[PDB]
Amino acid sequence: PEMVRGQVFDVGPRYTNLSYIGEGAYGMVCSAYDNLNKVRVAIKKISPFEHQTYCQRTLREIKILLRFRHENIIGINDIIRAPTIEQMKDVYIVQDLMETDLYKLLKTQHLSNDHICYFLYQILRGLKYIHSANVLHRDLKPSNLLLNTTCDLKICDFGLARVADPDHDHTGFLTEYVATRWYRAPEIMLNSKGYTKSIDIWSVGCILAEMLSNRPIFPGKHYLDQLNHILGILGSPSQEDLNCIINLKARNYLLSLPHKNKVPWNRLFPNADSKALDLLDKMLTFNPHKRIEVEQALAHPYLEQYYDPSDEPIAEAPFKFDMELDDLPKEKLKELIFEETARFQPG
Ligand SMILES: O=C(Nc1ccc2n[nH]c(-c3ccncc3)c2c1)[C@@H]1CCN(CC(=O)N2CCN(c3ccc(-c4ncccn4)cc3)CC2)C1
């Protein structure tokens, strides 16, 4: 097999001429030439079977992406793995090749308003479809938004996704959380497990702010500092929002803080479009029950030029399968990953 940066990348012979793109905790991603479709593709090598958590993230990624079909969501084109469960060590997932991601793009380019507007529209169009399937992404951020030269945008990474469960969203104050710190809604640190659609809208608001200034809006340095940053810009929560807070410890914490006035969006973003800032305000609303929903955000004046519900498709049915997968040992999850990838086997 070819080898990229030392490591074995055993995808031959359908995929050859490999080239490094990046890496992370998930594994490594390369570009490769597809010999059947005759085109370059992205291929990522996942090696998750030694730990339950890694198996859960792998199964969520595969199960969800195989069931979704939408222009603004990355698909899965092929899956390579051994013919038996005994021999299966690595899983290679083949996806459409894109040019870059929004994280990388914001390091080098300042985006015009019309690029921000079109990218935001596509994020929300893809999110409408995700949410219509009763799925939560739960880790939206610039590096999970893939882009090409024609400005097509595709959402990726469903490793932390879940089926929405508003009835079981409640948790205690300062409860541990896995998704990327800078994009966490304030309620994650106060009373929420991130099991409602509102969690994703907050992250989109953070992405919009980041496209406006090329800097993360709430760069918390650690868990509670994240909430410090959010309250530093939003200011102290209203009495009505405090009375919605659930937890004794969260209420006491917020009541103990000195009063903080809100930092106006037009002072943080003096060159931004006023309609973009009005939508940003509605996405970055403290109380998740008052935060704008995806369909309302699509209908906001900022996106009026693109808004077309007839061209913003929904999923044919909501997902009802387990995405917690909390009670399944890694051996059972390996069996499920094996079964879920069977359709790509030659025979
Ligand atoms: O889908 C993903 N990236 C893609 C996809 C298609 C692309 N086309 N073009 C590009 C591109 C990007 C940038 N510049 C140029 C081109 C693509 C990037 C990312 C990579 C990883 N993926 C998520 C994923 O594969 N899963 C969820 C996480 N999971 C997971 C996480 C951690 C661990 C783990 N393993 C060992 C140690 C620690 N953690 C294991 C499994 C595996 C399944 C999201």
Side-chain angles (χ1 to χ4, degrees):
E2 307 198 21
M3 310 253 294
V4 191
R5 306 231 170 162
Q7 182 135 212
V8 175
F9 224 83
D10 197 12
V11 292
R14 183 175 163 182
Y15 309 97
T16 70
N17 306 96
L18 320 171
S19 184
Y20 181 89
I21 292 175
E23 84 191 70
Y26 67 90
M28 176 175 153
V29 63
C30 297
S31 56
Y33 185 90
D34 182 343
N35 290 287
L36 178 67
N37 258 294
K38 299 240 137 238
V39 69
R40 270 176 95 71
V41 298
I43 308 179
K44 58 193 184 192
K45 178 180 186 192
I46 316 305
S47 305
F49 304 114
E50 304 293 319
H51 305 282
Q52 185 204 32
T53 292
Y54 307 160
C55 293
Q56 293 175 269
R57 292 176 186 166
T58 302
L59 185 61
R60 292 174 196 134
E61 173 78 352
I62 295 168
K63 290 199 70 154
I64 294 163
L65 293 181
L66 289 176
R67 288 163 179 76
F68 282 174
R69 184 171 179 280
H70 190 280
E71 290 182 339
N72 304 118
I73 303 176
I74 195 69
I76 286 175
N77 305 349
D78 197 7
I79 301 174
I80 299 161
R81 52 73 168 159
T84 68
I85 200 165
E86 287 88 353
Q87 298 174 111
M88 183 172 68
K89 309 284 130 217
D90 306 311
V91 177
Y92 299 87
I93 297 166
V94 184
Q95 305 181 273
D96 290 340
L97 179 64
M98 296 292 275
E99 182 72 33
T100 191
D101 62 54
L102 185 65
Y103 172 81
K104 291 197 277 174
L105 186 64
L106 295 173
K107 285 182 159 204
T108 64
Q109 295 286 330
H110 171 258
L111 297 178
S112 60
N113 178 63
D114 63 5
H115 280 100
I116 296 176
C117 187
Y118 185 54
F119 292 155
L120 182 63
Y121 175 67
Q122 291 181 83
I123 295 165
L124 293 165
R125 184 171 180 255
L127 193 60
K128 175 187 179 185
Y129 180 94
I130 298 166
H131 285 183
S132 77
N134 209 36
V135 171
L136 305 176
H137 182 289
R138 303 175 74 244
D139 201 16
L140 293 167
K141 54 180 174 174
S143 63
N144 284 336
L145 303 176
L146 308 177
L147 310 171
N148 68 12
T149 53
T150 53
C151 294
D152 295 315
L153 178 150
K154 293 177 192 289
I155 297 165
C156 74
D157 200 347
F158 289 74
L160 299 184
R162 295 291 195 282
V163 172
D165 189 1
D167 291 345
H168 303 100
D169 189 64
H170 59 272
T171 193
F173 176 59
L174 308 181
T175 293
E176 81 189 63
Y177 204 66
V178 176
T180 316
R181 193 195 301 123
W182 299 345
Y183 305 89
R184 288 174 190 162
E187 61 271 19
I188 291 304
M189 289 71 77
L190 297 167
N191 65 22
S192 173
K193 289 190 205 213
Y195 293 175
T196 73
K197 289 170 182 180
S198 57
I199 202 65
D200 284 334
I201 295 295
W202 178 275
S203 303
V204 176
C206 294
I207 292 162
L208 173 56
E210 197 160 342
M211 292 193 280
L212 295 165
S213 61
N214 294 78
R215 48 170 178 74
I217 183 177
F218 308 123
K221 285 205 258 44
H222 45 262
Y223 191 89
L224 191 50
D225 193 42
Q226 191 60 35
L227 183 54
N228 290 355
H229 276 262
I230 295 164
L231 297 174
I233 286 177
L234 294 192
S236 305
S238 67
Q239 175 172 239
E240 187 171 72
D241 291 351
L242 259 73
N243 284 355
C244 287
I245 222 71
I246 319 295
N247 288 327
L248 173 58
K249 292 184 181 173
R251 182 161 177 282
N252 289 344
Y253 178 63
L254 297 171
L255 290 171
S256 76
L257 297 170
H259 180 214
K260 181 65 179 53
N261 277 320
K262 169 185 160 146
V263 176
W265 299 111
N266 77 331
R267 293 285 189 183
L268 283 161
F269 306 109
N271 307 129
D273 182 281
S274 68
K275 291 175 179 162
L277 298 185
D278 186 76
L279 177 53
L280 180 66
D281 184 62
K282 290 175 166 57
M283 297 181 130
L284 299 182
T285 291
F286 179 84
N287 184 338
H289 297 104
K290 294 176 179 167
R291 193 176 299 148
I292 198 167
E293 302 199 335
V294 68
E295 293 169 302
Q296 294 173 291
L298 281 166
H300 188 277
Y302 184 54
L303 300 175
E304 183 182 4
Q305 74 193 96
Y306 296 114
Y307 185 50
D308 179 359
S310 78
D311 194 34
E312 292 158 5
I314 60 166
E316 333 242 80
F319 294 4
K320 297 303 307 198
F321 55 91
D322 192 7
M323 290 284 83
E324 278 317 308
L325 302 157
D326 64 304
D327 54 351
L328 308 182
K330 63 181 183 315
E331 296 76 16
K332 173 63 183 170
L333 294 165
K334 183 175 189 186
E335 294 175 13
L336 298 170
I337 287 163
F338 187 78
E339 296 181 297
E340 196 64 38
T341 59
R343 49 176 273 182
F344 295 98
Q345 285 300 303

